[PDB]
A paper describes a structure:
Crystal structures of TbMDO were determined to 1.95 Å and 1.2 Å resolution (for crystal form 1 and 2, respectively) and crystal structure of TcMDO to 2.0 Å resolution. The two crystal forms of TbMDO are almost identical with RMSD of 0.4 Å. Structures of TbMDO and TcMDO comprise residues from 11–261 and 13–257, respectively and share a highly conserved structure (RMSD 0.84 Å). When comparing the ADP-ribose bound structure to apo-TbMDO, it is evident that the binding site for ADP-ribose in TbMDO is preformed.
We show that the trypanosomatid MacroD1/MacroD2 homologues are hydrolyzing both protein-linked ADP-ribose and free O-acetyl-ADP-ribose. Active site of the macrodomains is located at the C-terminal edge of the β-sheet and is lined by N-terminal ends of four α-helices.
Residue numbers in the entry: 13 to 21, 39 to 261
The structure:
């Protein structure tokens, strides 16, 4: 029933999947993906939230409560993993089996089952998004997206469209974003930020009533200040 990939359809994956799980971990892994949104995760003996004081939707402040669109956009100074929203975004690579930066961080907080779930599919194409459970994150789901290497605006735009499409299709009402393609993938920060906000605005204009909050988590001050300058 859930759509888990925006696109069209390994010794490393084999070995990830053959690693032992406890019975309690199996119970978590076994929850069907669509049930994870609403399940009482504390009913699973193997589960815990790895973020001591998650940031909830109520705690965020939108950019402009009076604006039709900007009342649904917030900026957050901190890591995306803090956010207790329906989904957070992971900036992945095409192998989609973890890495450095935010990808590494998300995997560390979520715990080992996130990698295990990523090993059940064959990576992620550039511009597309894979949906997984979020395990020990306060957020319910992770939207793993693969940005372009280099300044390819139509593929960075596609990433945002893919993320937002999956949220719409699956009834997810709040999304925490990280910077996609900036830094190691070399997408210049200001142009990337213009695209992130532009695509999110366009989506909110077209699908008003489907999303309650798009929060841009800015782990670095330069990211935060760039988002701030682009929203006024």
């Amino acid at each position: 029933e859930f759509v888990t990939y925006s696109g069209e359809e390994s010794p490393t994956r084999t070995r990830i999947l053959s690693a032992a799980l406890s019975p309690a971990e199996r119970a978590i892994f076994d929850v069907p993906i669509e049930k994870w949104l609403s399940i009482d995760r504390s009913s699973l003996s193997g589960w815990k939230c790895a973020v001591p004081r998650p940031v909830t939707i109520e705690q965020l402040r939108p950019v402009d409560p009076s604006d039709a669109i900007l009342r649904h956009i917030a900026l957050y100074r901190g890591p995306v993993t803090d956010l207790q929203l329906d989904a957070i975004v992971n900036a992945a690579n095409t192998r989609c089996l973890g890495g450095g930066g935010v990808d590494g961080a998300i995997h560390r907080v979520a715990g080992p089952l996130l990698l295990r779930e990523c090993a059940t599919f064959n990576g992620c194409q550039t511009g597309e998004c894979r949906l997984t459970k979020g395990y020990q994150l306060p957020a319910r789901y992770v939207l793993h997206t693969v940005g372009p290497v280099g300044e390819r605006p139509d593929m960075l735009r596609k990433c945002y469209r893919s993320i937002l499409s999956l949220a719409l299709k699956n009834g997810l009402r709040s999304i925490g974003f990280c910077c996609v393609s900036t830094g190691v993938y070399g997408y210049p920060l200001l142009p990337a930020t213009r695209i992130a906000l532009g695509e999110t605005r366009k989506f909110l204009e077209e699908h008003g009533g489907a999303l309650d909050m798009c929060c841009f988590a800015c782990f670095q001050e330069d990211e935060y200040k760039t988002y701030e300058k682009c929203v006024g």
